[PDB]
């Protein structure tokens, strides 16, 4: 078995190997990459996502989210408070302000310490989930706006044509902006490209150990657990690496820098934070190996998780028994 300790693997494809996305994901899996739950892909030196980022300031963040925490430093939840609209120019200025800027630090490790020590005492503002793309239409390789769609994958594998569309999202981050512990909708893959700015640190639990994370989360968030059998779908809970180590949860960590791709694999729980002003783009995708995970994915039916138009058809076709109850939650 390849990669039995489930370590995060880093790949360096040649320009030739960067042509066929599907084939490269399948190569990574042949080397065991999926066992970790997350892989890093460094693009060939010849490649570029677009010519410059000099003209992005007028993009609108219609609903910036202030991430307010509750709990203790290592075990907390966050809620998203809606703020007034602002442009990317305005947001970048705010990120760089004395109130919100990254503090002086020695290295990534010192910054990670400071994050886990101090995150709960601040409420950073995240420009998340903005429909759109920063890839140039002429970038032919690994263009996240030009991937094969999940609807077409399900049709190719299973023969059923379904409604729905699949488009990328932009994330504008600042220091301490946080992504809570989650897997993707319907335990899909995700791909994330860090277009610009400061790094993003990731934590991941191997898919084969996901249920261990879920059991710990039920213990640490007992009211949430009673309210919903799949409350991590709400994307609000944080558990620190110290806490995971104390409870024997297997995980790994890695920092993504500007110009690098990360891929999350089906049922790979992940969480993390941004080091300072940055812009990432991400999208869900599928492969033939995803189908079985989609069929088994948990669902939130308490009504909190509330998801995209396109998830309807995935539930309807892959989880017909669940469909009725899940849709009650959606309505």
Residues in contact with Mg ion by CB under 5 A are: 56, 58-59
Of 199-238, which residues contact ligand OGA (CB under 6 A)?
none
User: Sign of dihedral through CA atoms 282, 284, 287, 292?
Assistant: positive
Q: Which does 264 bind (CB under 5 to 8 A by kind): Zn ion, Mg ion, ligand OGA, none?
A: ligand OGA
Residue ranges of the binding site for 2-oxoglutarate: 126, 192, 200, 235
| Two tokens, residue 75 | 């075990």
Beta carbon of residue 102, minimum distance to Zn ion (angstroms, whole number): 34
Find the DSSP H helices in 232-275: 241-246
Backbone angles phi, psi at 324, to 5 degrees: -35, -65
Residue ranges of the binding site for Fe cation: 182, 184, 270
Mask: binding to ligand OGA, 246-275, rule CB under 6 A, as x and -?
------------------x-----x-----
Strand partners, 80: 67
User: Sign of dihedral through CA atoms 268, 270, 276, 277?
Assistant: positive
Distance of CA 76 to the CA centre of its chain: 19
190 binds ligand OGA (CB under 6 A): yes
Q: Which does 304 bind (CB under 5 to 8 A by kind): Zn ion, Ni ion, ligand OGA, none?
A: Zn ion
141 binds ligand OGA (CB under 6 A): no
Query: Residue 288 carries which DSSP code?
Result: T
Backbone angles phi, psi at 202, to 5 degrees: -120, 145
The contacts found for 242-246 with CB under 8 angstroms, 24 or more apart, are: 242/74, 242/116, 243/74, 243/75, 244/203, 244/213, 244/216
216 binds Zn ion (CB under 5 A): no
180 binds Zn ion (CB under 5 A): no
**What number of chain residues touch ligand OGA (CB under 6 A)?**
8
Mask: binding to Ni ion, 186-225, rule CB under 5 A, as x and -?
----x-----------------------------------
Q: Which member of 179, 193, 267, 326 binds ligand OGA (CB under 6 A)?
A: 179
236 binds Zn ion (CB under 5 A): no
Q: Which member of 134, 216, 236, 300 binds Zn ion (CB under 5 A)?
A: 300
| Two tokens, residue 3 | 């990669």
Q: How far apart are CA 238 and CA 178, in angstroms?
A: 9
What strand order describes the sheet that includes 178-182?
Answer: 178-182, 269-274, 200-205, 252-256
Give the footprint of Zn ion on this chain (CB under 5 A): 228, 300, 302, 304
Residues that bind ligand OGA (CB under 6 A): 171, 179, 190, 192, 264, 270, 280, 282
């Amino acid at each position: 078995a390849q990669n039995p300790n489930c370590n995060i693997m880093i790949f360096h494809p040649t320009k030739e190997e960067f042509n066929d996305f599907d084939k490269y994901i399948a190569y990574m899996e042949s080397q065991g990459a999926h066992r970790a739950g997350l892989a890093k892909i460094i693009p060939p030196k010849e490649w570029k996502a677009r010519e410059t980022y000099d003209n992005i300031s007028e993009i609108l963040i219609a609903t910036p989210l202030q991430q307010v925490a509750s709990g203790r430093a290592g075990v907390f939840t966050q809620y998203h408070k809606k703020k007034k609209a602002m442009t990317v120019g305005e947001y970048r200025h705010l990120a760089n302000s004395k109130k919100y800027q990254t503090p002086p630090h020695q290295n990534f490790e010192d910054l990670e310490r400071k994050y886990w020590k101090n995150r709960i005492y601040n409420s950073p503002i995240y420009g998340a989930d903005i429909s759109g793309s920063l890839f140039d239409e002429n970038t032919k390789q690994w263009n996240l706006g030009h991937l094969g769609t999940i609807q077409d994958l399900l049709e190719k594998e299973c023969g059923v044509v379904i409604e729905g569309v699949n488009t990328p999202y932009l994330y504008f981050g600042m220091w301490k902006t946080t992504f809570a512990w989650h897997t993707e909708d319907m335990d899909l893959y995700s791909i994330n490209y860090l277009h610009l700015g400061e790094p993003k640190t990731w934590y991941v639990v191997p898919p084969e150990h996901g249920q261990r994370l879920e059991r710990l989360a039920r213990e640490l968030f007992p009211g949430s657990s009673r309210g919903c059998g799949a409350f991590l779908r709400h994307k609000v809970a944080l558990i620190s690496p110290t806490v995971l180590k104390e409870n024997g949860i297997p995980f790994n960590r890695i920092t993504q820098e500007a110009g690098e791709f990360m891929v999350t694999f089906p049922y790979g729980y992940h969480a993390g934070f941004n080091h300072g002003f940055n812009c990432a783009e991400a999208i869900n995708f599928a492969t033939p190996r995803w189908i079985d995970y989609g069929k088994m994915a948990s669902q939130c039916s308490c009504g909190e998780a509330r998801v995209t138009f396109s998830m309807d058809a995935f539930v309807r076709i892959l989880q017909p028994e669940r469909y009725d109850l899940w849709k009650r939650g959606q309505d």
